[PDB]
Write a protein that binds this ligand. Structure first.
Ligand SMILES: NC1=N/C(=C2/CCNC(=O)c3[nH]ccc32)C(=O)N1
Ligand SMILES: O=S([O-])[O-]
Length: 257
């Protein structure tokens, strides 16, 4: 509909797999029922985007109350399903996924877009296992005519969200996306999330700020990637490593099997 057949639910709004009746071409179709401004910004952001680690936008048609965004099908599914609970994945796989995730985030930030909800559910895999960032539903412009604006809206997903965003009335966009990339890396390497939220109220978060790496997420990780996580998961956003410096990090540049 209309041209394409909607053939299977990919991830409920709902994303359908759409197979072109004629050519056999597959794409994903995202269906959003405007009766059931976020969708306007999402299409608007997607039309700016062009990069091999961001999910391709093909166009949209608005057929009534129903928006249909045609988007690159990623047949590998979600990063999330390559993370084995309590285990993670092999370190070389985590590293390559991390490199590609950084290439995508560098790109977004260079065009002044912040994703604001990076997590394994939103990180999709294509046919050759290349990661693509998806879902610009919560994305927003943080730089325009070369002037940065601070963010005020609290959004994202608690386990991934940086602590300043719970504590500051306004904060810089880029360090929040960096932090969430660090939590994704932890999840890859340990197969578990370090805390429910980065709060005062949260025992495991206090444990980390006190450097108790003999405790569980951290003791599964290993000293080179763990040293990088020490630089990303810094509570103060001004002392947190930036992406140019992530690129200089020793594990980041370690050749892996
Ligand atoms: N979170 C999110 N996932 C999206 C898609 C659309 C992009 N391509 C897909 O293959 C897909 N599979 C499962 C979900 C999706 C999407 O657009 N946002
Ligand atoms: O424990 S933190 O300061 O990396």
């Amino acid at each position: 509909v209309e041209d394409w057949d909607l053939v299977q639910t990919l991830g409920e709004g709902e994303v359908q797999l759409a197979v072109n009746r004629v050519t056999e071409e597959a794409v994903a179709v995202k269906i959003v029922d405007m009766k059931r401004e976020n969708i306007k910004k999402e299409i608007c952001i997607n039309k700016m985007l062009n990069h091999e680690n961001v999910v391709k936008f093909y166009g949209h048609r608005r057929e009534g109350n129903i928006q249909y965004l045609f988007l690159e099908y990623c047949s590998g599914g979600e990063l999330f399903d390559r993370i084995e609970p309590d285990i993670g994945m092999p370190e070389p796989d985590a590293q390559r996924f991390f490199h590609q995730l950084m290439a995508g985030v560098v790109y977004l930030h260079g065009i002044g877009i912040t994703h604001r909800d990076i997590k394994p559910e939103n990180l999709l895999l294509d046919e050759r296992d290349n990661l693509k960032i998806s879902d610009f539903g919560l994305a927003t412009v943080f730089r325009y005519n070369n002037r940065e604006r601070l963010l005020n809206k609290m959004c994202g997903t608690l386990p991934y969200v940086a602590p300043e965003l719970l504590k500051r009335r306004e904060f810089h966009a880029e360090p929040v996306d960096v932090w969430s990339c660090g939590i994704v890396l932890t999840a890859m390497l340990a197969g578990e999330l370090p805390w429910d939220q980065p709060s005062d109220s949260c025992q495991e978060y206090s444990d980390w700020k006190e450097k108790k790496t003999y405790l569980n997420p951290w003791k599964k990780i290993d000293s080179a990637p763990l040293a990088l996580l020490h630089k990303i998961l810094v509570e103060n956003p001004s002392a947190r490593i930036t992406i140019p410096d992530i690129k200089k990090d020793r594990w980041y540049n370690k050749p892996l099997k």
